Design a protein around this ligand. Structure first.
Ligand SMILES: Cc1ccc(-n2nc(C(C)(C)C)cc2NC(=O)Nc2cccc(Nc3ncnc4ccc(N)cc34)c2)cc1
Ligand SMILES: Cc1ccc(-n2nc(C(C)(C)C)cc2NC(=O)Nc2cccc(Nc3ncnc4ccc(N)cc34)c2)cc1
Ligand SMILES: CCCCCCCCO[C@@H]1O[C@H](CO)[C@@H](O)[C@H](O)[C@H]1O
Ligand SMILES: CCCCCCCCO[C@@H]1O[C@H](CO)[C@@H](O)[C@H](O)[C@H]1O
Ligand SMILES: CCCCCCCCO[C@@H]1O[C@H](CO)[C@@H](O)[C@H](O)[C@H]1O
Ligand SMILES: CCCCCCCCO[C@@H]1O[C@H](CO)[C@@H](O)[C@H](O)[C@H]1O
Lengths: 337, 339
């Protein structure tokens, strides 16, 4: 049980153990605020996320538990891990604030696509690592839903980690079914995003730079073509089917022609990721075994999540219970080596 | 007059090297590069061949590649690693993507030794003399090693020592100067003298001086020996919160080192006192240490050379990857082997 100190930073109170020094705001919003800090115990730069109003709404209370529980179980080279979690509170009664701590990310993938023309091997290595972390995330029944270059931390050695930085437009990497307000969607949405990211690493530019969601969808159909009869058989929404069925047919462009400078294996993989029908998209685990990643793929070193349930929508509790569940997860936390 | 190259794969790694280098076997690997031991048929020497990893894949890697080549091309001293050769398979700048560095193959490091024998005082004399002689040279080129530790000091069968950097990816923190762990933003050469003091102590006692489990523990262990900061030193810390923090600790006196290192040569103890001072401005320098009576058997003021002027101006430049690559290529092409 450390000694805590108290400061204000941009109209928010930060109560943090002595071990973290030189707290410097690096971002804030309705989900949390983050400070970069110096971890005196380790000498590493850390990010300290203070969650915003964690128990003031039921949805906040729930988000608070979901994030801590998830992050406590994320133990993979290509996924953000939890270095520390704390609270200034000394008991459950006083418990109203939670702080999450991770390795500070310097650079993201967007910092990289804006600095240089990537070689093929550099694209192989980056997309390999995305797919490796995603295979692990998906095996826990988690969908990322916002994969984009700014949520992908890349160090000096091109070692990549998936985070969620939310506190380069999201719409640009987003699966069409999300933009269409689909009833359910699944983890295949994130494969669409990876397709958009890989394209951009291959050409240097945003694949579908839409100005709004409808422009976005227009650009997508232009490349991949209008839905086929097989896909239409699976659209539940009458008004959607009506609209989609009105459109003039658009053919699928030849990707080998679009991406004329790219490795044909890279082109082949993009064709398997950027498919309208999400059921026909390649999965993260299947994409790892694609020839494009032959120099990187190791089926005995592409691990999957631990057995804890991370997908528990059914639980309909009250703020107080989500609160004590969270409090227990904080107290039981064991730091990584 | 380009050599003929042969290709092979060692550990998912392609090694393309001139025929002169035979019998490659991998001896180390990591994020910075991979190393193979080899036999240089031209010279009859065993060599180490280090293939840099992803040399031009990032701006940071590109500048590291250049930095390492420049530094190794400069180092011409008996107690410091020298460059025997540098090569690339590339025939032009437009082909240039791989860099290989060749040095004399080192047998053991100093760490292998301390574990394996209790060292005589003449033995510690010789090893520490050679570290300071190399350090005097490195420091004279305005280079700071920053990671001096037994695993970065190679020692042959004749007890001849070279400083290098074996790192490719025994804790560094154990030999690290207290100000580096305090995040002092403008540290200087004297950090390496701290490290030498820690290494000498270990050679005398046979055990790590300050085996800290983290940065805080490390500092605790250091203060148990050297004492909590004096009034002189506290005044050099301009942070009120830092000052008050240190003052609220249980105050530790300085231990008398002669009372700590039992049975050691009194001269070695005196030298260690001069190296392990908390205030870096008060530490002995490498040049000064060489003249300490501890090394009277070894010291020769006419055989402790300094480096030719070293142009480090690149460090302060922010350049493109293909610019760093082109500059590295110039240095590959201009390399002249040592006779
Ligand atoms: C409700 C909820 C649930 C889960 C997440 N979540 N999910 C994930 C995946 C799926 C990738 C494992 C990750 C999160 N959360 C997450 O990343 N949280 C988090 C925790 C601590 C710090 C940070 N943020 C940052 N970490 C490191 N460097 C940073 C640099 C700048 C900056 N603005 C934020 C940083 C994020 C987010 C929200
Ligand atoms: C980015 C960068 C810059 C500079 C260095 N650096 N600095 C120095 C000083 C300060 C001592 C001059 C030396 C290095 N680099 C360095 O030693 N590189 C290097 C080059 C070639 C081979 C080796 N490694 C080895 N050399 C000889 N025998 C070995 C035996 C085993 C093994 N695993 C490695 C060996 C290291 C290292 C990295
Ligand atoms: C105008 C653009 C048409 C968009 C078509 C998007 C098709 C999305 O793909 C659909 O995803 C669903 C949700 O995961 C699945 O249930 C469906 O089976 C699948 O076909
Ligand atoms: C699955 C698709 C269902 C929703 C798509 C509706 C978006 C319509 O598209 C929009 O509407 C205008 C006409 O209404 C058009 O002139 C424009 O193309 C566009 O702004
Ligand atoms: C255990 C208490 C922590 C000690 C903190 C020491 C950090 C000193 O930090 C240094 O202090 C100097 C003081 O003028 C400044 O010149 C430097 O810029 C600053 O980095
Ligand atoms: C908690 C124990 C305090 C350790 C204090 C270490 C003092 C280091 O020494 C300091 O190093 C700085 C960096 O070069 C110099 O600028 C200062 O002049 C010097 O006093």
């Amino acid at each position: 049980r450390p000694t805590f100190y108290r400061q204000e930073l941009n109209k928010t109170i930060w109560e943090v153990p002595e071990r973290y020094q030189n707290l410097s705001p690096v971002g804030s919003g309705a989900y949390g605020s983050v400070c970069a800090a110096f971890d005196t115990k380790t000498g590493l730069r850390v990010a300290v996320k203070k969650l915003s109003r964690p128990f003031q709404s039921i949805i906040h209370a729930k988000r608070t538990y979901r994030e801590l529980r998830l992050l406590k179980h994320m133990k993979h080279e290509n996924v953000i891990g939890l270095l520390d979690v704390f609270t200034p509170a000394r008991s459950l009664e006083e418990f109203n604030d939670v702080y999450l701590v991770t390795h500070l990310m310097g650079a993201d993938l967007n910092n990289i696509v804006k600095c240089q023309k990537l070689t093929d091997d550099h694209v192989q290595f980056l997309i390999y690592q995305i797919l490796r972390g995603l295979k692990y995330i998906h095996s826990a029944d988690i969908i990322h839903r916002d994969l984009k270059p700014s949520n992908l931390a890349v160090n000096e050695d091109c070692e990549l980690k998936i985070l969620d930085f939310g506190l380069v437009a999201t719409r640009w990497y987003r699966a069409p079914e999300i933009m269409l307000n689909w009833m359910h969607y699944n983890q295949t949405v994130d494969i669409w995003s990876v397709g958009c990211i890989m394209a951009e690493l291959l050409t240097g530019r945003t694949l579908f730079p839409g100005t709004d969601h409808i422009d976005q969808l227009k650009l997508i159909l232009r490349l991949v073509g209008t839905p086929g009869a097989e896909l239409l058989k699976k659209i539940s929404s009458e008004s959607a089917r009506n609209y989609i069925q009105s459109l003039t047919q658009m053919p699928k462009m030849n990707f080998a022609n679009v991406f004329i400078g790219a490795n044909p294996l890279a082109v082949d993989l993009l064709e398997k990721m950027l498919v309208l029908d999400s059921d026909k998209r390649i999965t993260a685990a299947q994409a790892l075994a694609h020839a494009y990643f032959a120099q990187y793929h190791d089926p005995d070193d592409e691990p999957v999540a631990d057995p804890y349930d991370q997908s528990f929508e059914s639980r309909d509790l009250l703020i107080d219970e989500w609160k004590s569940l969270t409090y227990d997860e904080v107290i039981s936390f064991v730091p990584p080596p």
